[PDB]
Amino acid sequence: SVDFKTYVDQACRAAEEFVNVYYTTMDKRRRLLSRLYMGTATLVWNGNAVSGQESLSEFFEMLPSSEFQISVVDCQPVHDEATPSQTTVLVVICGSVKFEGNKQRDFNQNFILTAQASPSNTVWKIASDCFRFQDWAS
Amino acid sequence: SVDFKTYVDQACRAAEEFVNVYYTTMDKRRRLLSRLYMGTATLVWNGNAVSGQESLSEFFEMLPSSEFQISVVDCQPVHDEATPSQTTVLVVICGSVKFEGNKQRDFNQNFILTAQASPSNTVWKIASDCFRFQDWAS
Amino acid sequence: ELKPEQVEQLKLIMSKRYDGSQQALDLKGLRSDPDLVAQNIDVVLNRRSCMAATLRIIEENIPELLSLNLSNNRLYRLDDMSSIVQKAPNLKILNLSGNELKSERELDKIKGLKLEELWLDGNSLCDTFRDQSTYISAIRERFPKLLRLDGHELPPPIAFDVEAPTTLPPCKGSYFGTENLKSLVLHFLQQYYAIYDSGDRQGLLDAYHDGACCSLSIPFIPARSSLAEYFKDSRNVKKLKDPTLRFRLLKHTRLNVVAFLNELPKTQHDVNSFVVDISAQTSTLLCFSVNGVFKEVDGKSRDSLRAFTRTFIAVPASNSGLCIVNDELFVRNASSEEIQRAFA
Amino acid sequence: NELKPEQVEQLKLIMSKRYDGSQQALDLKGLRSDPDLVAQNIDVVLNRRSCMAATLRIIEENIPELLSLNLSNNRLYRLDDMSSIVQKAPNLKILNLSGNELKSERELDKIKGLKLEELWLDGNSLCDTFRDQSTYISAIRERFPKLLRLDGHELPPPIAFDVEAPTTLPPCKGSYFGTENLKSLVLHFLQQYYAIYDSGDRQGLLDAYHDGACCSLSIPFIPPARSSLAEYFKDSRNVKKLKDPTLRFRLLKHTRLNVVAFLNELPKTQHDVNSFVVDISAQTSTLLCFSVNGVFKEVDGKSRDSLRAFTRTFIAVPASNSGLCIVNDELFVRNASSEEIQRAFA
């Protein structure tokens, strides 16, 4: 019904917009960041698991202020078999991050984005998050 | 032990720093604002009462993002009889504020600030807040 | 350049072509229309004049329309209809199929309006695109919102909702917390402003504390302003950085306070309209703010109406009396809405 | 003039005598008037830069912990010569400059860095110029916002507001598998996968990937220069840096055949499966996602002797015999960090 290349292009557009939204929001409006995540979403922050909007919000409130700078980004559309009748995309990012009172560190992070349709409007939510430092051992 | 004019001057400095701190934090990083208020402190926002650090934090979380523009400020030292053995100051401010999705409005706000001394460090917290719009009728 | 009667005929044809249930207006091959041809009326939509006219008609008669069809009319240019956003904002479906448009850029001018469904099938521009991905993105740039293109459903549009809040709490009139403070504070205000309005303010010395401080402020603005009388006494720490002068505008003891208050013009306060907030309550102190309006009786200020915000800090006195330690008065010109509801 | 090295040891002894262990107070009041130095006929003038420098040096070397100092009645016209005091005696919280000849406040700007709890400027010519103590206190407070006491008189509370911003990061964990089932399953799967991947003939992977499986490769930007990453350089995909769509399509591999065909072209590898760090981003009935952080060493070409670090993301839909089938595959490759190189193999 719809071409495959279209999914790739749309996924790219989605990722490049999302990076902007999420990271700008994380830097500027930490409070609102949590609302991007759906409730079912799971977050793995350096091996620490966070589930549910509430825990996500508290966890994000707990973290220091940030100023992310993104080196590289990549994205792929996801097979429908994994999420039947639901449009979804995978995004991976590598960059540098600077937390308050902590030295700057390079980071790798991946997101799973699912499109959610409501009769009035359609919006995308983060179905998963995994963040880790390149050098988390130190 | 110490002269009155010194208290007046100290009140001025206190006000001048506090305005910057409080309104800049309210504009940029809403999340941390609440930390200024004491636990006992009470907030009167357009006739709505807020008591306790938690309720204050949630209440501030509920509010739209802000861009305060301060017209005028005034301050006075407070008689010790009101707060025995505790240094405190009264500050009043009038300005304009622009909340997200709401038209800019003029506002008058007054604070009572009490100095808190700990062996390690001394810090000032807001003992009370009252905020009201010049035109709350509309 | 068409006679009004021809415009009425066109109106009638549009009314015939209009569909109420679906709210769809068909303008397909308007020039080829049997009625207009039979009436000898010639309407060329690609021409700017006729286009302007038909759009104006759309605006005039039916602004509720949600769907339109402009297929097979040979429009080379889309700027002449760029006003469509204003003429028919509610429009959610547009069809431009079978026409002469040569480039995608033509769409930039029709960008404003939001459509769920669009049709560009049959136009010369479709030929340039290699893959439908480029096509869809190219069309989506102008209309990020549309769900359907050329009768074919599209991937979900990509939008992210930060869900920032925009709604402020409902404003409330006056807060006293416990009723005791209402009775006590209001009573205190009645007495205070009863003495304050008298003209002889020496009655106030019983209310203020011995070391009591008082100060005055006004909104930052030049000459002959209604506030200009208070300007000479107003205190602003932001605009005035000099300390020794700042000291002078503050009155340290009750004598200087009431002496200073005697210098303020005579006043009459609408105590009924007063709006009171209790900022804080302690065993040792009680703070409250009084927002209201007052009218003066003497001087240039005469017949003028002022609005005020006054903050009080009070330490308890015997028999539920309050003793003022700090006093701050902020004075400004009243709003029209406040003037209308000034008294009674 | 300059002082003889022998005199410096004596002065050091005098300082040690004038120093007090219990209170951590070092007194240098009227150092020239000191009987010993006068008896040795040694003349030490503190307002002179040499003697002061010497004194500071002695303080830093001998006693870095001292919290209190006294420089009264030493007739110092200028205070810049001791401006280094901040580094020499960081712990210092109490200073006394009473009875000296300095007439202006400006002299303090150079002594601004250090923080003092208590200060003494009494008896100096500068105190006379100020009309009211408010001006005095404000003027001094500008330089030392922290000090509690001035001229033996406790002061109004210092002006500070604590936003109380956070600075502590969460505790890092090694690997998250959630339920043990996922640990066993995922680890087992990685053993098999990378056992096949390391073999040299990667076609064994075709049983793992789905028919419509997508795969992509990325590397951190190098601002070619024949860097070690230069082999992966031809294949890396970055949507931020590459805006052309038709290429983006192709840098992505749509079907298992093209995926493994592409994977066979990648150099041979040796992976520390033991050291691998696994995170399970999400789990659903329909799919399972996880990330693998590790390092690998290559076995072919000149570049082989180099060690690379990698982060690989996997999405998997369940398959027969408790196996999982990959739908999406993303590989991020960079040269490994020194700390990673050191702990490369056990």
Author numbering:
A (entry chain D), B (entry chain B): 3 to 140
C (entry chain A): 203 to 423, 427 to 549
D (entry chain C): 202 to 424, 427 to 549
What does the original paper state about this entry?
Because the linker between the C-terminal UBA domain and the remainder of NXF1 is thought to be very flexible and the N-terminal 95 residues of NXF1 are thought to have an auto-inhibitory role in mRNA binding, these two regions were deleted to facilitate crystallization and analysis of RNA binding. The asymmetric unit contained two copies of the complex that were arranged to form a domain-swapped dimer. Density for the RRM domain was not observed, probably as a result of its not having a well-defined position as a consequence of the flexibility of the RRM–LRR linker. Strikingly, the position of the LRR domain relative to the NTF2L:NXT1 region was the same in both copies. In addition to the interaction between the pre-α1 loop with the canonical NXT1 copy, the linker between the LRR and NTF2L domain also made contacts with the alternate non-canonical copy of NXT1 in a domain swapped manner (blue on orange). Hydrophobic contacts also dominated this interaction interface, where Ile360, Phe362 and Val364 were buried in a cavity of the non-canonical copy of NXT1. The resultant domain-swapped dimer generates a flat platform with 2-fold symmetry in which the three pairs of RNA-binding domains (RRM, LRR and NTF2L domains) are all arranged on one face that results in their being ideally placed to interact with a dimeric binding motif such as that found in the CTE. Consistent with the requirement that the nucleoporin binding sites of NXF1:NXT1 need to be available while mRNA cargo is bound, the putative nucleoporin binding sites consisting of the residues 486–491 and 519–521 and 527 of NXF1 were found on the opposite face of the NTF2L:NXT1 dimer.
The movement of transcripts through NPCs is mediated by NXF1:NXT1 (also known as TAP:p15), which is the metazoan homolog of Mex67:Mtr2, the principal mRNA export factor in Saccharomyces cerevisiae. NXF1 is a modular protein comprised of four domains: an N-terminal RNA recognition motif (RRM), a leucine-rich repeat (LRR), a nuclear transport factor 2-like domain (NTF2L) and an ubiquitin-associated (UBA) domain. NXT1/p15 is a 15-kDa protein that also has an NTF2-like fold and which forms a heterodimer with NXF1 via the NTF2L domain.
